[PDB]
Amino acid sequence: SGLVKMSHPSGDVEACMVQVTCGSMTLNGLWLDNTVWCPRHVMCPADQLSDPNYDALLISMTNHSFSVQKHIGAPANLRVVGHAMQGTLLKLTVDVANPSTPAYTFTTVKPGAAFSVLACYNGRPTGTFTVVMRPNYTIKGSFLCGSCGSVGYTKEGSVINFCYMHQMELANGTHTGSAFDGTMYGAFMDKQVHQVQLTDKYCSVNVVAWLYAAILNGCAWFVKPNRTSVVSFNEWALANQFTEFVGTQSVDMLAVKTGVAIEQLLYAIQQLYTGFQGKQILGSTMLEDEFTPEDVNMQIMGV
Amino acid sequence: SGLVKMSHPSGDVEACMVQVTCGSMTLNGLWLDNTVWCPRHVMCPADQLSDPNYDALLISMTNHSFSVQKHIGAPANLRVVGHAMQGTLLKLTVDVANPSTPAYTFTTVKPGAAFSVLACYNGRPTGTFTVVMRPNYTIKGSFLCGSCGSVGYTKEGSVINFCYMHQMELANGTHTGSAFDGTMYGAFMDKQVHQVQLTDKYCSVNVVAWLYAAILNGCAWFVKPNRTSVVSFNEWALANQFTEFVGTQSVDMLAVKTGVAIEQLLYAIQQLYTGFQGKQILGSTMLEDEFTPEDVNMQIMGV
Numbered sequence: 001s002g003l004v005k006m007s008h009p010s011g012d013v014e015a016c017m018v019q020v021t022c023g024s025m026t027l028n029g030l031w032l033d034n035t036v037w038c039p040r041h042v043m044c045p046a047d048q049l050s051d052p053n054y055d056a057l058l059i060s061m062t063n064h065s066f067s068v069q070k071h072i073g074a075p076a077n078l079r080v081v082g083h084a085m086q087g088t089l090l091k092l093t094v095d096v097a098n099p100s101t102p103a104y105t106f107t108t109v110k111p112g113a114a115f116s117v118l119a120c121y122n123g124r125p126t127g128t129f130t131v132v133m134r135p136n137y138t139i140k141g142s143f144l145c146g147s148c149g150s151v152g153y154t155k156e157g158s159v160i161n162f163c164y165m166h167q168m169e170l171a172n173g174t175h176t177g178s179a180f181d182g183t184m185y186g187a188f189m190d191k192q193v194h195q196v197q198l199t200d201k202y203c204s205v206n207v208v209a210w211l212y213a214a215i216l217n218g219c220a221w222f223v224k225p226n227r228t229s230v231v232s233f234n235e236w237a238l239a240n241q242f243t244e245f246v247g248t249q250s251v252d253m254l255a256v257k258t259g260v261a262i263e264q265l266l267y268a269i270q271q272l273y274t275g276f277q278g279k280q281i282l283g284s285t286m287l288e289d290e291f292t293p294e295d296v297n298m299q300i301m302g303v
Numbered sequence: 304s305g306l307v308k309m310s311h312p313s314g315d316v317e318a319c320m321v322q323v324t325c326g327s328m329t330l331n332g333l334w335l336d337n338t339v340w341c342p343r344h345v346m347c348p349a350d351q352l353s354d355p356n357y358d359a360l361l362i363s364m365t366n367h368s369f370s371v372q373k374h375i376g377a378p379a380n381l382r383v384v385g386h387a388m389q390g391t392l393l394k395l396t397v398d399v400a401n402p403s404t405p406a407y408t409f410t411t412v413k414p415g416a417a418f419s420v421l422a423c424y425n426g427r428p429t430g431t432f433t434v435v436m437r438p439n440y441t442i443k444g445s446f447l448c449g450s451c452g453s454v455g456y457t458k459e460g461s462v463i464n465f466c467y468m469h470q471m472e473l474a475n476g477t478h479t480g481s482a483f484d485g486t487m488y489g490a491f492m493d494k495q496v497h498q499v500q501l502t503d504k505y506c507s508v509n510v511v512a513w514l515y516a517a518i519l520n521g522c523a524w525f526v527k528p529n530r531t532s533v534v535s536f537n538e539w540a541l542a543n544q545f546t547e548f549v550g551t552q553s554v555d556m557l558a559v560k561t562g563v564a565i566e567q568l569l570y571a572i573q574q575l576y577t578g579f580q581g582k583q584i585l586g587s588t589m590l591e592d593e594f595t596p597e598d599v600n601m602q603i604m605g606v
Contacts, residue, residue, distance in 0.1 A: 001445075001446075001447075001472065001475045001476055002443060002444055002445040002446065002475070002476035002478070003445055003476075004308075004432040004434075004443075004444060004445040005307075005308045005432060006422070006430040006431065006432050006445060007310060007430065007431050007432070008430065008431075009313045009314075009317050009421065009428040009429070009430065009431060010312045010313050010314055010431070011312075011313060011314035011317040011318070011428075014312050014314040015314070118312065119309070125312040125314075126312070127309040127310065127311065127312065128309070128310050128311075128312055128313065128431060129307045129308060129309050129310065131307075140305055140307070141305055141307060142304075142305045142306060142307045142309060142602045143304075143305070144304075144602075144604075144605040145605070169304060172304045172305070172520055172521065173304050173305030173306070173520070174304075174305070175305070217475050217476060218475050276588070278588075280589070283443070284587075285587050285588040285589045286583070286586055286587065286588065299445050299447075302447075
């Protein structure tokens, strides 16, 4: 019993972290097979950060411009024998294939989905945490200067699904990055220029999942006979900064185990949004939306 | 910027997890050099869990009663060549030294201190999370059947400090275990009988650290010229379920950076305890005590 913010074991990903240097700029890279992935802003000098031209910067670079070092495990200097740009990322080719490359895929995450982040500094892993891709395509992490190139991922069976590479900080506690196809989540620019993020929203299906977790742990004071249909809730959601509720088999499993219908929890959300009234739910005083239905199913049952 | 629940990278500890079987009982063990540590209740059958005699159980065991298996990485069966009991733990001697034993120490954690937990099932790591040792010597984790033997630890430089081995669940979301010297935190018994835990307390130095994190994020409505000395606060704390405040260099660093004195935040705690005045602090309407000063310093300032 109990519900905590849980991350995937980070061992397989730690073995892929490397340091990438270009001029006087240093950040983290991901070493898979003979390829090192890193943010392309490593090529940008301080005096050009106010308005950079990445196509011009790439042309000016040679294999000599990049230095790749592995610090963890058996340390090694990797020879860069090729360089290329894919969207907002650099794809460096090195002469040694990573002997600890896990079985992996590249996947893009959708808003409301959770993933683990391995935070790194100078190619060294320092911490791990779980985040949810926000409806405004940002993440609320903990990243300081030098954390760029830190990676986000999930684990499915024995396969690591790499979904995020840390790029920038937009505002206090608000971060964004790219998918491994080179596209930045939310189409933000990888430049130190003015850019406003859209309004964030509460992830409705995650709040329902968290309320089911509370019921399964003996906390059900907020459950009443009252119900709100998913059609009525979704119209209400549009005007109250909540995402559209879309049901799934994982949510249905939680409804059948507890005997509490989804519609009863949509009504509870509308009431709890106007105040918890000094009461707690799982040690929280405001709605929690960073626990997915799959997360609750895993932490509460074998499912 | 941003404050999240952060764990240590779990790779070094994952390489030490093994499965220990004794009869029809199975749980997790920790493999360091030629030693495997596991909870001693692996020797206890289901019908004897209410009133066990561990000294009699140990005598009845032979090296062949224990089966040790490594599942992740390069799998191996380890042959048990010695067995011993140290408090609430078994110390098995195996014929192969773990080739990935990290540099380590055994340390007992004090209430208010944070540590990372690597949750395991059948010798397989499944997740990682951070907890604080509660003033009543329990932890609020997320553990299901089969998680016994999961380990807690901190990292100082390159040294892993193993501080906890999961033993039992006392109540919903309330867990306890032992230190690697064999002593159970809070002197709870490793047996199936009803045991009452003492009342919890708010960890004062952690609430001060969280109020400093709020000021660093632009939230300082609770800061007034009013001050409470640490001597006055500690007398008040005794009667109001708060731990004794003990200052540290990390708290002093937060006071210098923000320009807000410790004594102003001790007064603020006494006022916020009587109500949050219809406002919120970092997304909460109740005091938060699971972020330590070191945690706030490392995540906000990187020191």
